[PDB]
Amino acid sequence: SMSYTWTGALITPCAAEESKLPINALSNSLLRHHNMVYATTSRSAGLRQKKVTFDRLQVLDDHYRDVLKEMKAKASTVKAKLLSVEEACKLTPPHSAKSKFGYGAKDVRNLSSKAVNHIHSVWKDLLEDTVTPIDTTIMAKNEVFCVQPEKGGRKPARLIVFPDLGVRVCEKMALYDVVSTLPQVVMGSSYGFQYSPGQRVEFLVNTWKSKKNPMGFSYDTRCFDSTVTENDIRVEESIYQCCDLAPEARQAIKSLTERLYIGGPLTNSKGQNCGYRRCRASGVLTTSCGNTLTCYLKASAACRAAKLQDCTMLVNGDDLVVICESAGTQEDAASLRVFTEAMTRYSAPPGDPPQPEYDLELITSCSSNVSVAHDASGKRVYYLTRDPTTPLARAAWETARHTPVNSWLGNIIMYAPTLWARMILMTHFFSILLAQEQLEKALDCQIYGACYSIEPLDLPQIIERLHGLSAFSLHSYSPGEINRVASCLRKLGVPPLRVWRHRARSVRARLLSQGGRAATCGKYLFNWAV
Amino acid sequence: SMSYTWTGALITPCAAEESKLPINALSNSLLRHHNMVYATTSRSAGLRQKKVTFDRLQVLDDHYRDVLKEMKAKASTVKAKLLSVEEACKLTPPHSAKSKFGYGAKDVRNLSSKAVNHIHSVWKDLLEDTVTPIDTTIMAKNEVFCVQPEKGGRKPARLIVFPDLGVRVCEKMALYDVVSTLPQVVMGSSYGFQYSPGQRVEFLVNTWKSKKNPMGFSYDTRCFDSTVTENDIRVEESIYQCCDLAPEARQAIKSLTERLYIGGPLTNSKGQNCGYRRCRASGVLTTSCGNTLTCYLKASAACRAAKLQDCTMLVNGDDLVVICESAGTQEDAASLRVFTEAMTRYSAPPGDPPQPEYDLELITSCSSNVSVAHDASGKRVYYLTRDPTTPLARAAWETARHTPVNSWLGNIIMYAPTLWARMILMTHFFSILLAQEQLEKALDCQIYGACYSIEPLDLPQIIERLHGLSAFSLHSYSPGEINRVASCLRKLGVPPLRVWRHRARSVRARLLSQGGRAATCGKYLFNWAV
Ligand SMILES: Nc1nc2c(ncn2[C@@H]2O[C@H](COP(=O)(O)OP(=O)(O)OP(=O)(O)O)[C@@H](O)[C@H]2O)c(=O)[nH]1
Ligand SMILES: Nc1nc2c(ncn2[C@@H]2O[C@H](COP(=O)(O)OP(=O)(O)OP(=O)(O)O)[C@@H](O)[C@H]2O)c(=O)[nH]1
Ligand SMILES: [Mn+2]
Ligand SMILES: [Mn+2]
Ligand SMILES: [Mn+2]
Ligand SMILES: [Mn+2]
């Protein structure tokens, strides 16, 4: 069936949508080719609609059926509980869209009688009505990127579809305990969300080294959420039901699947009907868990169809990496084509055709890749890195326009061991913090699904806990990594690494001069510049 | 061993401790004998120390051993998970004592890097050190009561013992999922915390009616927390371990038991060592679950020792109610004495000797009792009520001194069907809200462990959901109930029920005049006054 059917009404914004990077001095200090940085807006919604709208034809075979039975057997060992209204309220994120029913996320978190009474009413309706399609709002996402001339230049905005806040809290009551435990049990070491960057690296490196002659590939499904069929969503519900659940949870899971997850009406910010969805909604509680289970099921089956040898998979939602034993250059190329044809039959066609890789560093998944450097004693230390283009463009944007969200700080934390986060991001931002006497002001930081209130002076301790002390002494980075960073700097017009090393010595000196926690930042975060 | 051993250092306050009800006009409108209302303070801590300090001698027998094996078998069917630091932070109550380590409950709830880093460090220490006693603070509680001349007049302050905020969050990581599920599985219908007031009434009434010749009694253990022995606390840990838990959770449960739950050093608000505890701490996560399991285990065994017939128990922490088949007047009296002797052997001696009751209304447990009234159609409606002395004294106190906590509102909600909450509390407070134009201002309200932000206009919907529509039309209350309320009014100097009916007609008229939600309050909450 068609992933979407549209009416003609437009996907409208609900506030000011800025698309251009403002000519600012502080930002230009970091990046000069400002015209290459842009943000998506509702203006490009039409383009996105075209690419996410298509007919899905799905043909399953015994490989798929066998994997699904194996998964259900594992799911049958899971026990999960219903969350109470109060627990679901307390776990509601601080800045989610307010309800159309008169209350917002703050009221939910504070257990206001208005929110609590309304949620009880939504829950009761979920149990008593298992068919009426539930309303969802469709919006174009506003995200910052760097133009890619070698392609369509600017990419169109992603479309997010989500139900009202009251329903969102009810989804947690029914499924929070399921989505936070089921994938791990069913997929074991293949469940990517259980890993921190270093633990992800550890699993990838140990897996790579375990093969006699390793071969690996990333698989990029074209518009994954759109490829998810009704059958896929009902298969997900059948896996959830294998768990030992409370009677009300079963009834609510079934109702949410029928009324919301399989599809339903799309309403714009103006209240007009935009169309109908028959694929995955990006904004429901089960999007992550559902996509991970479905990707794992389809890929597991496709590995069997392709007779790939001793496969080990790593799955994060729609992102997939497979490492296996190589059967030879042309054998591998042929087997990957068979793998792709199976994925295509299962309704997960590729965006870019997958390619066999024999160098672990060249495999990119979750926009990241493993790389190697050396610690103080010269020992090899593997770590997770990524192309710094998007992180830098966003850092420049946030430097120019105050942002309730500080992605740059999230990048400094998640990519602390990297050459670019250490030399460019840390230097640039601490320079600013010192100049504005804001070294002690906490900043909101979105990382791994949660919004933290982070004090810059806590960075040393945060990095040590997440990455270990070696993150402060890594050196002798790989040539591929050094070259990628250097190229990105040229492309973006950001000063070369020598300019940053110089700027960092100044920053470090300034930190040491203050002693205390500030000195600690100077000692550990900038030990590399000395 | 001794429940406590003291040093001589005093239990000190940490702020202003008011003990007298201030002569105020608004409050005097409700209650005139203001000198009968008082609040406990650290001044009486010594008296409380005397009563909670004693040697425990415990002798177990096969009845106890058999019940414990039965309990472990049920516990073995429970699976529970570890909460992450972030989940435990989000479930931390908004107003708990700040940490000695530089952050408070707001920082925890907001995932501040300072709180998060510290908690990770406390957790790591729990896993790596399983012996060092953990520090706890001892404080005298400040609570409001009405003098009881027939006894010691004013009761001494209760003593609360609790670990630092960081440890408290770690207790949730290890045990939140266990304490919220294990008791229900082990004890079934006997677990009192699964019931709302009406559901508690339903279980008690159906149980009472199921007996050929019902007999029941409440059992009040003298200073229960002090009677809990080291063996009892280790028995609790052994039950927790029967659950299917994560390896880290097992290690943390064991460490918390050894370092904190079995006992440890007591520090006052001034930092001085006050003594050592070898019994239950009132302020740990496991106090409720632990007390409930232990009370249930000891009482189950004691029912067997006393050969009580077809017993059905209801347990809420240290509060216990038993309903059984009567064996005759003197047979019952004898059997209860045997029951008490068994409880005493198990280290749960009575405060007041239990007495057999053959009238369900006369059994008080959890400071409450079942009573009967009639609905619109004249049908019998059972509901939960209680002596209104404490609720009224507190309502008077809160009327005189603004209080971040509005217990009166919690009482209006929990006891909405009662004659006193409807005629006195609702009338008095809505009268005030109307006069101060605060009918639409939300108020903080502590109910069932959570702090809600309640809007008065939401009361009708709250009461309907919790008690049903009949709560707005109950009439023809029992003579025992009417007499108890009337007597309390005399004792306290609060105007008789006729004065309240008159005042309510005015309040109702004023509400109706406004229409909208206010009119709804007038129609439902005061329909009785017409
Ligand atoms: N602040 C600063 N910017 C620099 C410095 N060196 C280079 N840049 C900037 O970094 C970018 C260099 O990118 P390239 O494309 O390699 O430029 P180039 O090779 O210097 O070319 P020309 O400018 O024509 O000499 C430009 O935006 C420069 O302005 C430096 O020492 N300080
Ligand atoms: N506001 C108000 N208070 C009343 C009214 N009737 C009685 N009270 C108060 O309620 C209490 C009555 O308690 P009792 O001990 O029964 O007093 P009593 O029987 O009236 O005794 P006397 O005052 O000596 O006639 C006193 O505090 C009275 O002031 C009334 O109509 N209005
Ligand atoms: Mn994709
Ligand atoms: Mn992807
Ligand atoms: Mn007691
Ligand atoms: Mn009690």
Tab-separated table of N, CA and C and ligand atoms in Angstrom, chain A residues 28-29 31-33 486 489-496 498-499 503, ligand 1:
chain	number	residue	atom	x	y	z
A	28	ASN	N	32.270	33.671	12.708
A	28	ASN	CA	33.213	33.735	11.604
A	28	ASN	C	34.618	33.395	12.078
A	29	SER	N	34.833	33.493	13.386
A	29	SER	CA	36.127	33.162	13.974
A	29	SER	C	36.359	31.669	13.760
A	31	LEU	N	34.231	29.627	11.506
A	31	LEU	CA	33.932	29.227	10.143
A	31	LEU	C	33.639	30.450	9.281
A	32	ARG	N	34.331	30.565	8.147
A	32	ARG	CA	34.156	31.714	7.260
A	32	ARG	C	33.218	31.538	6.069
A	33	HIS	N	33.079	30.323	5.563
A	33	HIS	CA	32.188	30.103	4.424
A	33	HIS	C	30.755	29.946	4.934
A	486	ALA	N	41.200	17.815	8.102
A	486	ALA	CA	41.842	18.913	7.376
A	486	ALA	C	41.024	19.329	6.165
A	489	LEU	N	37.971	21.300	7.148
A	489	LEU	CA	38.297	22.672	7.527
A	489	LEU	C	38.397	23.563	6.287
A	490	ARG	N	39.039	23.055	5.244
A	490	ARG	CA	39.178	23.818	4.011
A	490	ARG	C	37.804	24.107	3.426
A	491	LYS	N	37.011	23.055	3.256
A	491	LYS	CA	35.672	23.160	2.701
A	491	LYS	C	34.842	24.234	3.391
A	492	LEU	N	34.900	24.241	4.718
A	492	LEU	CA	34.118	25.169	5.530
A	492	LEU	C	34.742	26.527	5.772
A	493	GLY	N	36.022	26.649	5.459
A	493	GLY	CA	36.686	27.909	5.690
A	493	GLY	C	37.021	28.086	7.154
A	494	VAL	N	37.305	26.990	7.850
A	494	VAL	CA	37.685	27.127	9.248
A	494	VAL	C	39.211	27.102	9.275
A	495	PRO	N	39.820	27.916	10.139
A	495	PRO	CA	41.281	27.981	10.256
A	495	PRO	C	41.925	26.606	10.413
A	496	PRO	N	43.120	26.402	9.827
A	496	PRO	CA	43.804	25.107	9.940
A	496	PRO	C	44.208	24.769	11.377
A	498	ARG	N	46.821	24.321	12.938
A	498	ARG	CA	47.921	25.023	13.589
A	498	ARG	C	47.380	26.241	14.309
A	499	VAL	N	46.429	26.913	13.678
A	499	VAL	CA	45.836	28.085	14.273
A	499	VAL	C	45.136	27.690	15.566
A	503	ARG	N	45.820	28.999	19.479
A	503	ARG	CA	44.725	29.554	20.250
A	503	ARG	C	44.538	28.767	21.549
C	1	LIG	N1	42.303	33.255	11.426
C	1	LIG	C1	43.030	32.594	10.504
C	1	LIG	N2	42.432	32.096	9.431
C	1	LIG	C2	43.300	31.453	8.619
C	1	LIG	C3	44.657	31.277	8.773
C	1	LIG	N3	45.184	30.558	7.705
C	1	LIG	C4	44.155	30.313	6.939
C	1	LIG	N4	42.980	30.822	7.440
C	1	LIG	C5	41.645	30.723	6.864
C	1	LIG	O1	41.397	29.354	6.577
C	1	LIG	C6	40.940	29.210	5.206
C	1	LIG	C7	42.026	28.551	4.387
C	1	LIG	O2	41.450	27.640	3.455
C	1	LIG	P1	42.152	27.343	2.057
C	1	LIG	O3	41.126	27.116	1.006
C	1	LIG	O4	43.197	26.305	2.262
C	1	LIG	O5	42.897	28.772	1.802
C	1	LIG	P2	44.398	29.091	1.392
C	1	LIG	O6	45.118	27.911	0.971
C	1	LIG	O7	44.947	29.855	2.485
C	1	LIG	O8	44.231	30.064	0.149
C	1	LIG	P3	44.511	31.624	0.005
C	1	LIG	O9	43.606	32.335	1.001
C	1	LIG	O10	44.119	31.999	-1.409
C	1	LIG	O11	45.997	31.787	0.289
C	1	LIG	C8	40.550	30.614	4.766
C	1	LIG	O12	39.203	30.900	5.131
C	1	LIG	C9	41.524	31.490	5.548
C	1	LIG	O13	41.039	32.795	5.793
C	1	LIG	C10	45.293	31.822	9.928
C	1	LIG	O14	46.488	31.774	10.245
C	1	LIG	N5	44.380	32.476	10.754
